[PDB]
Paper text:
The spike protein of the SARS-CoV-2 binds to human angiotensin-converting enzyme 2 (ACE2) through the receptor-binding domain (RBD) and changes the conformation to fuse the viral and cell membranes, mediating viral entry. Here, we used a structure-guided strategy to engineer an inhibitor peptide with mutation-tolerant and potent binding ability against all SARS-CoV-2 variants. We named the peptide CeSPIACE (COVID-19 eliminative Short-Peptide Inhibiting ACE2 binding).
We identified a 39-mer peptide region that was easily chemically synthesized and modified it to improve structural stability and mutation tolerance. CeSPIACE exhibited high affinity to all mutant RBDs, but the kinetics differed depending on the mutant, with the binding rate being fastest for the Omicron-type RBD and the dissociation rate being slowest for the Alpha-type RBD. We confirmed in the crystal structures that the differences in kinetics were due to some typical mutations.
Author numbering:
A (entry chain B): 334 to 529
B (entry chain A): 1 to 39
Write the structure that this text describes.
């Protein structure tokens, strides 16, 4: 009963970072070292223990959060970070226990003339709580005048598009990101590594 | 004030988009983030 990590990592369409996806994984066995070696990742940073140590551990649930950002923004997918993505799009707690995995997807998510399917939130009145998800599209009041739900002077649609183009520099090219959270409740641990 | 410059910066970002300067737009978007974080 293998954990369906292929459905997350090998998914055809990833989500925009502001509307990040979450898959709950449970009641299965997963070889985390095989996941580490199944592709060439540019980031595979674990904050609890290593892939090899995960293979002896069991967890109640594993949550796989996936999305696309710029390569220069992957740094913000880490505890204690601030920035446009960490403040307004996807926030990790200071006490984070899990792995952040990322790889270049210029070959899939870039497009001649610009792929506008991937969005990010540019404006927000306050920073996100950890794992909070904000999919609203209220017009942002950036100035002193009320906006009344209409775009205008200092009244902005809160989302912008990445517009990925294969000729972007590496730092601006799209990277698919998968964040694994390892949840241990006072409950049966049914997600186990291949050597538990 | 601060309102006038933020609007022109927003407009440049939107125009760089339609003129296909996608990377240049994203670099301005970064500035809009840093600017509005200041008092
Ligand atoms: C993605 O697909 C390739 C080829 O089908 C496979 O070798 C790889 O293990 C898959 N990735 C995961 C995480 O299952």
């Amino acid at each position: 009963n293998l954990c369906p990590f292929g459905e997350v990592f090998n998914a055809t369409r990833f989500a925009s970072v502001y509307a990040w996806n979450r898959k709950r994984i449970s009641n299965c066995v997963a070889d985390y070292s095989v996941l580490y070696n199944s592709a060439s990742f540019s980031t595979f940073k674990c904050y609890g223990v290593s892939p090899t140590k995960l293979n002896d551990l069991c967890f109640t649930n594993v949550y796989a959060d996936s999305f696309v950002i710029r390569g220069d923004e992957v740094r913000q997918i880490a505890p204690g970070q601030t920035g446009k993505i960490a403040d307004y799009n996807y926030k990790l707690p200071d006490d984070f226990t899990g792995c952040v995995i990322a790889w270049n997807s210029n070959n899939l998510d870039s497009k001649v003339g610009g792929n506008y399917n991937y969005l990010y939130r540019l404006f927000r009145k306050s920073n996100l709580k950890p794992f909070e998800r904000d999919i609203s599209t209220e017009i942002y009041q950036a100035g002193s005048t009320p906006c009344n739900g209409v775009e205008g002077f200092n009244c902005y649609f809160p989302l912008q598009s990445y517009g990925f183009q294969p000729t972007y520099g590496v730092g601006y090219q799209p990277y698919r990101v998968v964040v694994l959270s390892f949840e241990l409740l006072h409950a049966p641990a049914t997600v186990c590594g291949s050597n538990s | 004030d601060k309102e006038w410059i933020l609007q022109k910066i927003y407009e440049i970002m939107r125009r760089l988009d339609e003129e296909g300067h996608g990377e240049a737009s994203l670099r301005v978007s970064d500035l809009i983030y840093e600017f509005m974080k200041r008092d």
